Amino acid sequence: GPHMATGQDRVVALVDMDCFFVQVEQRQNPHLRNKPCAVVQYKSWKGGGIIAVSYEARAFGVTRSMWADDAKKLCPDLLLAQVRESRGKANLTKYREASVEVMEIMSRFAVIERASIDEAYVDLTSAVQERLQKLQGQPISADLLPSTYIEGLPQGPTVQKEGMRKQGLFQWLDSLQIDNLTSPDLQLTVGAVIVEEMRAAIERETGFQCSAGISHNKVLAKLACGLNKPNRQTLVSHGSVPQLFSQMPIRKIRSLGGKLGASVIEILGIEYMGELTQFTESQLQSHFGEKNGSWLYAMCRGIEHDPVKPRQLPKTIGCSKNFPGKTALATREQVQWWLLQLAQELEERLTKDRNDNDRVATQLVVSIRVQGDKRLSSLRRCCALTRYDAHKMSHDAFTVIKNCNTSGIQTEWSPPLTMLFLCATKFSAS
DNA sequence: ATTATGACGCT
DNA sequence: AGCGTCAT
Ligand SMILES: Nc1ncnc2c1ncn2[C@H]1C[C@H](O)[C@@H](COP(=O)(O)OP(=O)(O)OP(=O)(O)O)O1
Ligand SMILES: [Ca+2]
Ligand SMILES: [Mn+2]
């Protein structure tokens, strides 16, 4: 009852850019705007692999991981933009730099956790407390929430989608009790007002649109964000969780999309997140371990405590290339040349990072993959990163991996390498 | 031949 | 440390 924690202590948002790499390319090239289009890497094998898709193109069934040649079968007029190639490899710098544009704007509003190249969590608890004082108990107008969906509403006693959005919003606002500065629902609402302002700022200052989720924790915020894309935001209240979760496949919740989620389903014989409430905490811990069990017990009730970490910059800087099928590296000279290509991009990114962010990487991690193994990584080895020098880093990488070569011959490399990966880690202030 | 990343957990 | 999982 009264001692039952409800996980309503925080206001957390997740802001995620809409079809991000596509928008970056559409900003640059106006001919691509408001068109079915996709971003592709490489071109020679099956037209290239699609890694981002505009919403116009998704309507034709175009998806990520599709070969462009196959996408063109669904959508003959599909427009394509190619990822830059430098030193023989796809180079994602344009998109990393566009990400920084967005992250710096968001950081003006609150502390953010960079979660990916195109999304960040926002801890709005303090900003909300501030805005609530300035509101001085004055009600929140629907005009302050022009792109907000309230999940689960409208309910009870309608043709248009925007009409539905407004009906739900008005039911929500009509019910709000604004005299209580500590009502979690009010706090979420003010959170949503701030996220409208954040999202407006992002679009004004970059040209990019995004979606957002507002809830009491990261997992609900992430789930919320996806419920109404593109270019909209969704508030998931604590009260909305039982209905929302009652038909929510377990795999949809962040961290349950893989083997653990499959095991929850198989072992417990359930399908939906809400069905988890019928197990004791000890029961869940018995099957999934202490940490996962406790996490699942709270999460299926809408409760999660993972903090928004104050981190705007990536913790690692890495360079990787696959060498599929018959392109697999089979000579020593080949392996060395590509290590150098990777090391040269890494040096360039590292040197910029040091100037921009007052830090230096101290460890170089080298990963490779061998033909036959379809684990992502066959082997990882670390060495000291003492100088930002591509020739040294590539020589050092070769040194830590050269032992994997089972070839009795000096020049030959066996089994051939199907992946190389250089990652700079363990930053220190400088 | 679903590529190029990036964070975090386990032992 | 080196491996695995999950994610975008
Ligand atoms: N599996 C991947 N491989 C390579 N790049 C990826 C992959 N997934 C995502 N990206 C890149 C391209 C995306 O534009 C960007 C952001 O990913 P993501 O948020 O999942 O989709 P998206 O922004 O393209 O569309 P959406 O509107 O659905 O969010 O990261
Ligand atoms: Ca996105
Ligand atoms: Mn994303």
Coordinates of C-alpha atoms (C1' of nucleotides) and ligand atoms in Angstrom, one line a residue:
Chain A
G1 CA 0.0 0.0 0.0
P2 CA 1.6 3.2 1.4
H3 CA 5.1 1.7 1.4
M4 CA 4.8 0.4 -2.1
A5 CA 7.3 2.2 -4.3
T6 CA 5.7 3.1 -7.7
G7 CA 8.7 4.2 -9.7
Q8 CA 7.3 7.7 -10.2
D9 CA 10.2 9.7 -8.7
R10 CA 11.8 10.8 -12.0
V11 CA 10.8 12.4 -15.3
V12 CA 12.9 10.8 -18.1
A13 CA 12.7 11.4 -21.8
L14 CA 14.2 9.5 -24.8
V15 CA 14.7 11.6 -27.9
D16 CA 15.3 9.7 -31.1
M17 CA 15.9 11.2 -34.6
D18 CA 13.6 10.2 -37.4
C19 CA 15.3 8.1 -40.1
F20 CA 18.5 9.9 -39.1
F21 CA 21.0 9.2 -41.8
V22 CA 18.3 9.9 -44.4
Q23 CA 17.6 13.3 -42.9
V24 CA 21.3 14.2 -42.8
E25 CA 21.4 13.4 -46.5
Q26 CA 18.1 15.2 -47.3
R27 CA 19.3 18.4 -45.5
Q28 CA 22.4 18.3 -47.7
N29 CA 20.6 17.5 -50.9
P30 CA 17.1 19.1 -51.2
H31 CA 16.3 16.9 -54.2
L32 CA 15.9 14.0 -51.8
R33 CA 13.4 15.8 -49.5
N34 CA 9.9 14.4 -49.2
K35 CA 10.8 11.4 -51.4
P36 CA 11.1 7.7 -51.0
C37 CA 14.8 7.4 -50.3
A38 CA 17.4 5.4 -48.4
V39 CA 21.0 5.5 -47.4
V40 CA 23.2 2.7 -48.7
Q41 CA 26.8 1.6 -48.1
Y42 CA 28.9 0.2 -50.9
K43 CA 27.3 -0.4 -54.3
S44 CA 29.0 -3.2 -56.1
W45 CA 27.3 -6.1 -54.3
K46 CA 23.6 -6.0 -55.0
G47 CA 23.4 -2.2 -55.2
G48 CA 24.7 -1.7 -51.7
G49 CA 23.2 -2.5 -48.3
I50 CA 20.5 -0.2 -47.0
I51 CA 21.1 1.2 -43.5
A52 CA 18.4 3.9 -43.3
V53 CA 15.0 4.4 -44.9
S54 CA 12.7 7.4 -45.3
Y55 CA 9.1 7.0 -44.2
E56 CA 7.9 7.5 -47.7
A57 CA 10.1 4.5 -48.8
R58 CA 8.9 2.4 -45.8
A59 CA 5.4 2.5 -47.2
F60 CA 6.7 0.5 -50.1
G61 CA 8.2 -2.1 -47.8
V62 CA 11.8 -0.9 -48.0
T63 CA 13.7 -1.8 -44.8
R64 CA 17.1 -1.7 -43.2
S65 CA 19.4 -4.7 -44.2
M66 CA 17.8 -4.9 -47.6
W67 CA 20.1 -4.8 -50.7
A68 CA 19.3 -1.7 -52.8
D69 CA 18.7 -3.9 -55.9
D70 CA 16.0 -5.7 -54.0
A71 CA 14.6 -2.5 -52.5
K72 CA 14.3 -1.2 -56.1
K73 CA 12.0 -4.1 -56.9
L74 CA 9.6 -2.9 -54.2
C75 CA 10.1 0.8 -55.0
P76 CA 11.4 1.5 -58.5
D77 CA 11.7 5.3 -57.9
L78 CA 13.6 4.9 -54.6
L79 CA 16.3 7.5 -54.3
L80 CA 19.6 6.6 -52.8
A81 CA 22.4 8.4 -51.0
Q82 CA 25.7 6.7 -50.5
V83 CA 27.9 6.6 -47.3
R84 CA 31.2 8.3 -48.0
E85 CA 34.1 6.0 -48.7
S86 CA 37.6 6.8 -47.5
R87 CA 40.7 4.7 -47.4
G88 CA 38.7 1.8 -48.9
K89 CA 35.9 1.7 -46.3
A90 CA 32.6 3.3 -45.3
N91 CA 33.2 6.4 -43.3
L92 CA 30.5 7.6 -41.0
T93 CA 31.9 11.0 -40.0
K94 CA 29.1 13.1 -41.6
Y95 CA 26.6 11.3 -39.3
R96 CA 28.7 11.5 -36.2
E97 CA 29.1 15.3 -36.7
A98 CA 25.4 15.7 -37.3
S99 CA 24.8 13.7 -34.1
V100 CA 27.0 16.2 -32.2
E101 CA 24.8 19.1 -33.5
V102 CA 21.8 17.5 -31.9
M103 CA 23.4 16.4 -28.7
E104 CA 24.8 19.9 -28.0
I105 CA 21.3 21.4 -28.4
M106 CA 19.7 18.8 -26.1
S107 CA 22.5 19.4 -23.5
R108 CA 21.2 23.0 -23.1
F109 CA 18.0 21.7 -21.5
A110 CA 19.3 19.0 -19.3
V111 CA 22.0 16.4 -18.6
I112 CA 21.9 13.8 -21.3
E113 CA 23.0 10.2 -21.8
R114 CA 24.2 9.5 -25.4
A115 CA 22.5 6.1 -26.1
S116 CA 23.4 5.8 -29.8
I117 CA 24.4 8.0 -32.7
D118 CA 20.9 9.3 -33.0
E119 CA 19.3 9.2 -29.5
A120 CA 19.8 10.4 -26.0
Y121 CA 18.0 10.1 -22.7
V122 CA 17.2 13.2 -20.8
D123 CA 16.7 13.5 -17.0
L124 CA 14.1 16.2 -16.7
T125 CA 13.2 15.9 -13.0
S126 CA 14.9 19.1 -12.0
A127 CA 13.8 21.1 -15.0
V128 CA 10.2 20.1 -14.4
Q129 CA 10.4 21.2 -10.7
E130 CA 11.7 24.5 -12.0
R131 CA 9.0 25.0 -14.6
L132 CA 6.3 24.0 -12.1
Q133 CA 7.3 26.9 -9.9
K134 CA 7.1 29.4 -12.8
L135 CA 3.7 28.0 -13.8
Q136 CA 2.4 29.0 -10.3
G137 CA -0.5 26.6 -10.4
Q138 CA -1.7 27.7 -13.8
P139 CA -3.2 24.9 -16.0
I140 CA -1.4 23.5 -19.0
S141 CA -2.9 24.5 -22.3
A142 CA -3.2 21.9 -25.1
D143 CA -1.5 24.5 -27.3
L144 CA 1.7 23.8 -25.4
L145 CA 1.5 20.1 -26.5
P146 CA 0.9 20.3 -30.2
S147 CA 2.6 17.0 -31.1
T148 CA 2.0 14.9 -28.0
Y149 CA 0.1 11.6 -27.7
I150 CA -1.1 10.4 -24.3
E151 CA -0.8 6.6 -24.5
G152 CA -4.1 4.8 -23.6
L153 CA -6.3 7.8 -24.4
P154 CA -8.9 8.6 -25.5
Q155 CA -11.0 6.0 -23.8
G156 CA -14.8 5.5 -23.4
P157 CA -17.3 7.8 -25.3
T158 CA -12.9 10.2 -34.0
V159 CA -12.3 9.5 -37.7
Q160 CA -9.0 11.4 -38.1
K161 CA -5.6 10.6 -36.5
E162 CA -5.0 14.1 -35.4
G163 CA -8.5 14.3 -34.1
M164 CA -7.8 11.2 -32.0
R165 CA -4.6 12.7 -30.7
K166 CA -6.4 15.8 -29.6
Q167 CA -9.3 13.9 -28.0
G168 CA -6.8 11.9 -25.9
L169 CA -4.8 15.0 -25.0
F170 CA -7.9 16.9 -23.9
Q171 CA -9.2 13.9 -21.7
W172 CA -5.7 13.9 -20.1
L173 CA -5.5 17.6 -19.5
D174 CA -9.1 17.8 -18.3
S175 CA -8.3 15.3 -15.6
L176 CA -5.0 16.8 -14.4
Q177 CA -4.8 18.2 -10.9
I178 CA -2.3 21.1 -11.2
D179 CA -2.5 22.3 -7.5
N180 CA -0.3 19.3 -6.5
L181 CA 3.3 20.1 -7.4
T182 CA 4.3 16.5 -6.7
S183 CA 1.6 14.7 -8.7
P184 CA 3.6 12.4 -11.0
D185 CA 1.1 12.8 -13.9
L186 CA 1.5 16.6 -13.7
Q187 CA 5.3 16.2 -13.6
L188 CA 5.2 14.0 -16.7
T189 CA 3.0 16.6 -18.5
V190 CA 5.4 19.4 -17.8
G191 CA 8.2 17.1 -18.9
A192 CA 6.3 16.7 -22.2
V193 CA 6.0 20.5 -22.5
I194 CA 9.8 20.8 -22.1
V195 CA 10.4 18.1 -24.7
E196 CA 8.1 19.9 -27.2
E197 CA 10.5 22.9 -26.7
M198 CA 13.6 20.7 -27.0
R199 CA 12.3 19.1 -30.2
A200 CA 11.3 22.5 -31.6
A201 CA 14.8 23.8 -30.9
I202 CA 16.4 20.7 -32.6
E203 CA 14.3 21.2 -35.7
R204 CA 14.8 25.0 -35.8
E205 CA 18.6 24.8 -35.4
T206 CA 19.4 21.7 -37.4
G207 CA 16.6 21.0 -39.8
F208 CA 16.1 17.5 -38.3
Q209 CA 12.9 16.1 -36.9
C210 CA 12.7 13.6 -34.1
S211 CA 10.3 11.7 -31.9
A212 CA 10.4 11.3 -28.2
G213 CA 9.0 9.3 -25.3
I214 CA 8.3 10.8 -21.9
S215 CA 7.9 8.6 -18.8
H216 CA 9.3 7.8 -15.4
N217 CA 12.3 5.8 -16.5
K218 CA 14.5 4.9 -19.5
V219 CA 12.8 1.7 -20.6
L220 CA 9.3 3.3 -20.6
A221 CA 10.6 6.4 -22.3
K222 CA 12.3 4.3 -25.1
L223 CA 9.1 2.3 -25.6
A224 CA 7.0 5.4 -25.6
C225 CA 9.2 7.1 -28.2
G226 CA 8.4 4.4 -30.8
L227 CA 4.6 4.4 -30.3
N228 CA 4.0 7.4 -32.5
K229 CA 6.7 8.0 -35.1
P230 CA 7.7 10.1 -37.0
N231 CA 7.8 13.7 -35.7
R232 CA 5.6 13.1 -32.6
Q233 CA 6.1 12.4 -28.9
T234 CA 4.3 10.1 -26.5
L235 CA 3.7 10.3 -22.8
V236 CA 3.4 6.9 -21.0
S237 CA 2.1 7.5 -17.6
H238 CA 2.4 5.0 -14.7
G239 CA -1.3 4.4 -14.9
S240 CA -1.1 3.4 -18.6
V241 CA 1.3 0.5 -17.9
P242 CA -1.1 -2.3 -17.1
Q243 CA -3.2 -1.9 -20.3
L244 CA -0.1 -1.1 -22.4
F245 CA 1.8 -4.2 -21.1
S246 CA -1.2 -6.5 -21.3
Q247 CA -0.7 -7.0 -25.0
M248 CA 3.0 -6.0 -25.3
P249 CA 5.2 -8.8 -26.7
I250 CA 8.2 -9.3 -24.3
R251 CA 10.7 -8.8 -27.1
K252 CA 9.7 -5.1 -27.5
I253 CA 11.2 -4.1 -24.2
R254 CA 14.8 -2.9 -24.3
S255 CA 17.2 -5.7 -23.4
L256 CA 14.6 -8.4 -24.0
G257 CA 14.8 -8.6 -27.8
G258 CA 17.4 -11.4 -27.7
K259 CA 18.1 -14.7 -26.0
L260 CA 16.9 -13.6 -22.5
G261 CA 13.6 -12.5 -23.8
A262 CA 13.2 -15.8 -25.7
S263 CA 14.0 -17.7 -22.5
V264 CA 11.4 -15.7 -20.5
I265 CA 8.8 -16.7 -23.1
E266 CA 9.8 -20.4 -23.2
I267 CA 10.5 -21.0 -19.6
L268 CA 7.4 -19.2 -18.2
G269 CA 5.1 -20.0 -21.2
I270 CA 4.0 -16.4 -21.6
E271 CA 3.9 -13.9 -24.4
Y272 CA 3.2 -10.4 -23.0
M273 CA 5.1 -8.2 -20.6
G274 CA 2.1 -7.9 -18.3
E275 CA 1.9 -11.6 -17.7
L276 CA 5.2 -11.3 -15.7
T277 CA 3.3 -9.8 -12.8
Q278 CA 2.1 -13.3 -11.7
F279 CA 5.5 -14.5 -10.7
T280 CA 7.3 -13.8 -7.4
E281 CA 10.6 -11.9 -7.4
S282 CA 12.3 -15.1 -6.2
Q283 CA 10.7 -17.1 -9.0
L284 CA 12.0 -14.7 -11.6
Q285 CA 15.4 -14.7 -9.9
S286 CA 15.5 -18.5 -9.9
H287 CA 15.2 -18.6 -13.7
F288 CA 17.0 -15.5 -14.9
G289 CA 19.5 -14.7 -12.1
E290 CA 19.4 -12.3 -9.2
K291 CA 19.9 -9.1 -11.3
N292 CA 17.6 -9.9 -14.2
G293 CA 14.9 -11.4 -11.9
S294 CA 14.7 -8.2 -9.8
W295 CA 14.8 -6.1 -12.9
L296 CA 12.0 -8.1 -14.5
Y297 CA 9.8 -8.0 -11.3
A298 CA 10.0 -4.2 -11.2
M299 CA 9.9 -3.7 -15.0
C300 CA 6.7 -5.5 -15.6
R301 CA 5.1 -3.1 -13.1
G302 CA 6.5 -0.1 -15.0
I303 CA 9.3 0.4 -12.5
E304 CA 13.0 0.8 -13.4
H305 CA 15.8 2.6 -11.6
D306 CA 18.7 2.8 -14.2
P307 CA 20.0 6.3 -14.1
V308 CA 20.4 8.6 -17.0
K309 CA 24.2 8.7 -17.0
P310 CA 25.9 12.0 -17.5
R311 CA 27.7 11.1 -20.6
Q312 CA 27.4 13.0 -23.9
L313 CA 30.5 11.6 -25.6
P314 CA 31.2 8.0 -26.8
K315 CA 33.4 6.0 -24.4
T316 CA 35.3 4.4 -27.3
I317 CA 36.4 5.3 -30.8
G318 CA 36.5 2.4 -33.3
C319 CA 37.1 1.4 -36.9
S320 CA 36.0 -1.9 -38.4
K321 CA 35.7 -3.6 -41.8
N322 CA 34.2 -6.9 -42.9
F323 CA 35.8 -8.9 -45.7
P324 CA 33.0 -11.3 -46.8
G325 CA 33.1 -14.4 -49.0
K326 CA 36.0 -14.4 -51.4
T327 CA 37.3 -10.9 -50.3
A328 CA 38.6 -12.5 -47.1
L329 CA 42.2 -11.4 -46.5
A330 CA 44.6 -14.3 -47.3
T331 CA 48.0 -12.7 -47.5
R332 CA 50.1 -11.0 -44.9
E333 CA 50.5 -7.9 -47.0
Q334 CA 46.7 -7.7 -47.3
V335 CA 46.2 -7.9 -43.6
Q336 CA 48.8 -5.2 -43.1
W337 CA 47.5 -2.8 -45.7
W338 CA 44.0 -2.9 -44.2
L339 CA 45.3 -2.6 -40.6
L340 CA 46.9 0.6 -41.9
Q341 CA 43.7 1.9 -43.5
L342 CA 41.8 1.3 -40.3
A343 CA 44.6 2.9 -38.2
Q344 CA 44.7 5.9 -40.4
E345 CA 41.0 6.6 -39.9
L346 CA 41.4 5.9 -36.2
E347 CA 44.3 8.4 -35.9
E348 CA 42.3 11.1 -37.7
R349 CA 39.3 10.6 -35.4
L350 CA 41.5 10.3 -32.3
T351 CA 43.4 13.5 -33.0
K352 CA 40.2 15.4 -33.5
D353 CA 38.7 13.9 -30.3
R354 CA 41.8 15.0 -28.3
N355 CA 41.5 18.6 -29.5
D356 CA 37.7 18.7 -29.1
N357 CA 37.3 16.9 -25.8
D358 CA 40.5 17.2 -23.7
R359 CA 41.2 13.5 -23.4
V360 CA 43.5 10.8 -24.7
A361 CA 42.8 7.1 -25.3
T362 CA 45.3 4.7 -23.6
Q363 CA 44.4 1.3 -24.8
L364 CA 44.2 -0.1 -28.3
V365 CA 41.8 -3.1 -28.7
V366 CA 42.3 -5.4 -31.8
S367 CA 39.6 -7.8 -32.9
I368 CA 39.6 -10.2 -35.8
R369 CA 37.4 -12.8 -37.3
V370 CA 38.3 -15.9 -39.1
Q371 CA 36.6 -17.6 -42.0
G372 CA 34.3 -20.3 -40.7
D373 CA 33.5 -18.6 -37.5
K374 CA 30.3 -16.7 -37.5
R375 CA 30.6 -15.2 -34.0
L376 CA 31.1 -11.5 -34.5
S377 CA 34.5 -11.7 -33.0
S378 CA 36.9 -14.6 -33.1
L379 CA 39.6 -13.0 -31.1
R380 CA 40.3 -9.8 -29.1
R381 CA 43.7 -8.6 -27.9
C382 CA 44.7 -5.4 -26.3
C383 CA 47.9 -3.4 -26.3
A384 CA 49.1 0.0 -25.1
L385 CA 48.1 3.1 -27.1
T386 CA 50.9 5.4 -26.3
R387 CA 51.0 7.6 -29.4
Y388 CA 48.4 8.8 -31.9
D389 CA 50.3 7.4 -34.9
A390 CA 48.7 5.2 -37.5
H391 CA 51.8 3.3 -38.6
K392 CA 52.6 2.5 -35.0
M393 CA 49.1 1.5 -34.1
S394 CA 48.8 -0.8 -37.2
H395 CA 52.2 -2.4 -36.5
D396 CA 51.2 -2.9 -32.9
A397 CA 47.9 -4.5 -34.0
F398 CA 49.7 -6.8 -36.3
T399 CA 52.0 -7.8 -33.5
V400 CA 49.2 -8.9 -31.2
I401 CA 47.3 -10.8 -33.9
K402 CA 50.1 -12.3 -36.1
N403 CA 50.1 -15.5 -33.9
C404 CA 46.7 -16.4 -35.2
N405 CA 48.1 -17.2 -38.5
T406 CA 48.3 -21.0 -38.9
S407 CA 49.9 -20.8 -42.3
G408 CA 53.4 -22.3 -42.2
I409 CA 54.2 -19.9 -45.0
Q410 CA 55.6 -16.4 -44.2
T411 CA 53.5 -14.5 -46.9
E412 CA 50.2 -16.4 -46.6
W413 CA 47.5 -15.9 -44.1
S414 CA 45.3 -18.8 -43.0
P415 CA 42.5 -19.1 -42.3
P416 CA 41.6 -15.9 -44.1
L417 CA 40.4 -13.0 -42.1
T418 CA 36.8 -11.9 -42.6
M419 CA 36.9 -8.9 -40.2
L420 CA 39.3 -6.4 -38.7
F421 CA 38.5 -4.0 -35.9
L422 CA 40.6 -1.4 -34.1
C423 CA 39.1 0.3 -31.0
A424 CA 40.6 3.0 -28.9
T425 CA 39.5 2.8 -25.3
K426 CA 40.3 3.8 -21.7
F427 CA 40.4 7.6 -22.0
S428 CA 42.3 9.8 -19.6
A429 CA 41.9 13.6 -19.2
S430 CA 44.5 15.7 -21.1
Chain B
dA1 C1' 27.6 -11.0 -48.7
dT2 C1' 22.5 -8.1 -42.6
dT3 C1' 27.9 -3.5 -42.2
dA4 C1' 29.8 -0.3 -38.9
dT5 C1' 29.7 0.6 -35.0
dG6 C1' 29.0 1.2 -29.4
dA7 C1' 27.7 0.0 -24.2
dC8 C1' 27.7 -3.2 -20.7
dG9 C1' 27.6 -8.1 -18.3
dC10 C1' 30.1 -12.5 -17.0
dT11 C1' 33.8 -15.0 -15.2
Chain C
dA1 C1' 41.5 -9.7 -19.5
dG2 C1' 38.9 -11.9 -23.1
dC3 C1' 34.2 -13.4 -24.2
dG4 C1' 29.3 -12.7 -25.0
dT5 C1' 24.8 -10.2 -25.4
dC6 C1' 22.0 -6.6 -27.0
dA7 C1' 21.6 -2.6 -29.3
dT8 C1' 21.2 1.1 -33.3
Ligands
LIG1 N1 22.1 -2.1 -38.0 C1 22.6 -0.9 -38.4 N2 23.7 -0.9 -39.1 C2 24.3 0.3 -39.6 N3 23.7 1.5 -39.2 C3 22.6 1.5 -38.5 C4 22.0 0.3 -38.1 N4 20.9 0.6 -37.4 C5 20.8 2.0 -37.3 N5 21.8 2.5 -38.1 C6 22.1 3.9 -38.3 C7 21.3 4.5 -39.4 C8 20.2 5.1 -38.7 O1 19.7 6.2 -39.5 C9 20.7 5.5 -37.4 C10 19.6 5.5 -36.3 O2 19.0 4.3 -36.2 P1 17.5 4.0 -35.8 O3 17.1 5.0 -34.8 O4 17.3 2.6 -35.4 O5 16.6 4.2 -37.1 P2 16.3 5.5 -38.0 O6 16.7 6.8 -37.3 O7 17.0 5.4 -39.3 O8 14.7 5.4 -38.2 P3 13.6 5.7 -37.1 O9 12.7 6.9 -37.5 O10 12.7 4.4 -37.1 O11 14.2 5.8 -35.8 O12 21.7 4.6 -37.1
CA2 CA 16.0 7.1 -35.1
MN3 MN 17.8 5.3 -32.5

